[PDB]
Amino acid sequence: SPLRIFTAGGTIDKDFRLEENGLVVGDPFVAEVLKTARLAGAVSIVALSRKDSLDFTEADREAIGRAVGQAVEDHILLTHGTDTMVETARYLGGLPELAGKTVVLSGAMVPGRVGGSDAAFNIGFACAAALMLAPGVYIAMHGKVFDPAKTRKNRGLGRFEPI
Amino acid sequence: MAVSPSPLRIFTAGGTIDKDFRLEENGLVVGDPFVAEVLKTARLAGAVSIVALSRKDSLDFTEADREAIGRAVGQAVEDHILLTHGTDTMVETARYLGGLPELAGKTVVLSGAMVPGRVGGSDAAFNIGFACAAALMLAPGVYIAMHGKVFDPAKTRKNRGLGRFEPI
Amino acid sequence: SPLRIFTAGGTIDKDFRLEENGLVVGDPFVAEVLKTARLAGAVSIVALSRKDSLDFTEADREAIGRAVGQAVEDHILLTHGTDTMVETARYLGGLPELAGKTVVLSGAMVPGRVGGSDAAFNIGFACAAALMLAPGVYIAMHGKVFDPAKTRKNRGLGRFEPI
Amino acid sequence: MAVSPSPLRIFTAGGTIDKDFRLEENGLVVGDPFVAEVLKTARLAGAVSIVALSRKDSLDFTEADREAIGRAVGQAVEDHILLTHGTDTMVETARYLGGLPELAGKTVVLSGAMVPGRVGGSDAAFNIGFACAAALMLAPGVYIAMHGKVFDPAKTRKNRGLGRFEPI
Ligand SMILES: N[C@@H](CC(=O)O)C(=O)O
Ligand SMILES: N[C@@H](CC(=O)O)C(=O)O
Ligand SMILES: N[C@@H](CC(=O)O)C(=O)O
Ligand SMILES: [Cl-]
Ligand SMILES: [Cl-]
């Protein structure tokens, strides 16, 4: 079935810029991973945001909700910052218009363009989850599936964990 | 205090995925399993055992090479199994496993890479994430997870020229 | 002839830390490049500093000067931040105690651990410059040797340039 | 207004450095020149003209292969030249160039890699930086730059066993 991929930024997409002496949220890393994945099937990627998810407002979440509602596809991957991924996932879970869709949020604790990143693994795992899970809203990270209502991000731990 | 299960076990049978350069051969050999390098940086909640069954290019695979694999998979208590393997006889190995009543309650997923993990622009890390998900989320049975999709072994072939699995 | 490598930090050594949500100056990247360089010769690496060179003082340069004078080697590579590389190199150029040594400063505009880095090339180029140039102090960057007295860092181009 | 000179020219004659994985052949072939990928991100002050002469493994090399290299190097305007090359016949190529009086004013350096640039853990990027510096800074003559040092081709051999150049 067709997968639609939305990019909302996050650590996954960070890249070095000379002018900043540091990382900015750059081009979506998911496009770089899928470029060498030798895909059989139909995938389309759409840019929504280049924020760190720590800076997301109620209206940023509502804009993400609108974009997912404009998609005819029922298999959705949203790449995103880990810091408010739970907030975005809870918000999407509450929109009846998305009830028929399998929506999976994912990202990376380390930028894809930095050595030793989880990003490529997480993208493969999340693409499969978006294809294979029943309708609902999920966080796919650490090689497992989280329910957003019963999940938090534990910064001290460096992992999502159940409440 | 919740204890993370380890519901997935990985077996390695070699293939392009695991190829590495050696000075000795002046070429690629089947090296250490690349899946182990991907899981080291995957920040897994669980722990995943990685059992080495074989180290060949799948072209050189016999009925008893396939039968060794069958019994190792059979004796695993885990019901979620990923087997990394060469692409040239993956379909043959998958068909053989699909006939073992012993595996009837297991989700068994075969995967690899068309480009070695240790070579630039490889599909390996994506395919490992996809296939781990497949082994966890598909109903019991035997599957090939390649190219971002699930193949039925019985209704699949390998196109050697194009380096892709295709339906029949 | 034996090469001594001092690491003072800089963009070349930056690495991602979950805790900081960004880059820190990490372990020296020159050690990672030389690990796979299959060297025939005698090389030793010594850690001096992990600063961004923007934060170096006259006192820090004086310390760097004395540390380079501790080496009995006559061929020296100092990996260093690019922002005050010229100030450090001009300072060392005026130290009579270093007049018999070939001292080469280098670094990278992009961290070694980020994709698309100049670091490995710069380290190879700078190792050769330290071994092959006549006694003096030099900056090796952009595939050329700069005279520190006649050089500046021009953020306009993102490069060092002659004055 | 200041013009940056381009005093170094690079010629590529293939070798392990340039090997890349090809689905079709189920292995490594000599691919595009890896030196071009390193120089792309080196943020050079100048430009380096990179010219592909040959795509062999250095073993498939007859006097006529060497002779085309000798002419291309002889006709270059630049007096600083780097030739990337397989390590198995690097000494033979270097000794042949050392015999051409038209090269008398030129600093000519041969280099390559024991591991393909496109394989994990390669010496290539370091070897390219080191050899570029060597081509610019050594007096006229012909040299091999490998293992972070400079070799006299007359006094050097490739130890295929230990994967290194060494003195005789
Ligand atoms: N600060 C990042 C953290 C991450 O993505 O892992 C974000 O939420 O955008
Ligand atoms: N010849 C390889 C092909 C691959 O794995 O992609 C094999 O079957 O092991
Ligand atoms: N801010 C960095 C810049 C660099 O090294 O490129 C430093 O000078 O330490
Ligand atoms: Cl940063
Ligand atoms: Cl090969």
Residue numbers in the entry:
A (entry chain B), C (entry chain C): 6 to 168
B (entry chain A), D (entry chain D): 1 to 168
Manuscript text:
L‐Asparaginases (ASNases) catalyze the hydrolysis of L‐Asn to L‐Asp and ammonia. In contrast, the chain of ASNase from Rhodospirillum rubrum, reported here and referred to as RrA, consists of only 172 amino acid residues. RrA is homologous to the N‐terminal domain of typical bacterial class 1 ASNases and exhibits millimolar affinity for L‐Asn. Crystal structures of the wild‐type RrA, both with and without bound L‐Asp, as well as structures of several RrA mutants, reveal topologically unique tetramers.
Based on the previously published results for typical class 1 ASNases (Derst et al., 1994; Schalk et al., 2016), we tested two mutants, RrA(Y21A) and RrA(Y21F). When crystallization was done in the presence of L‐Asp, the ligand was present in three out of four protomers and the main chain became fully ordered. As expected, the phenyl group of Phe21 occupied almost exactly the same position as Tyr21 in RrA(wt), leaving no room for any water molecule(s). L‐Asp was bound predominantly by one chain, except that a hydrogen bond was made between its amino nitrogen and the OD2 oxygen of Asn26 of the adjacent protomer. Although both were less active than RrA(wt), RrA(Y21F) is somewhat more active than RrA(Y21A), which is opposite to the results obtained for typical class 1 ASNases. While it is quite plausible that in RrA Tyr21 contributes to proton transfer from the primary nucleophile (Thr16), almost certainly its side chain also contributes to stabilization of the tetramer. In this role, substituting Tyr with Phe preserves this role better than the mutation Tyr → Ala.
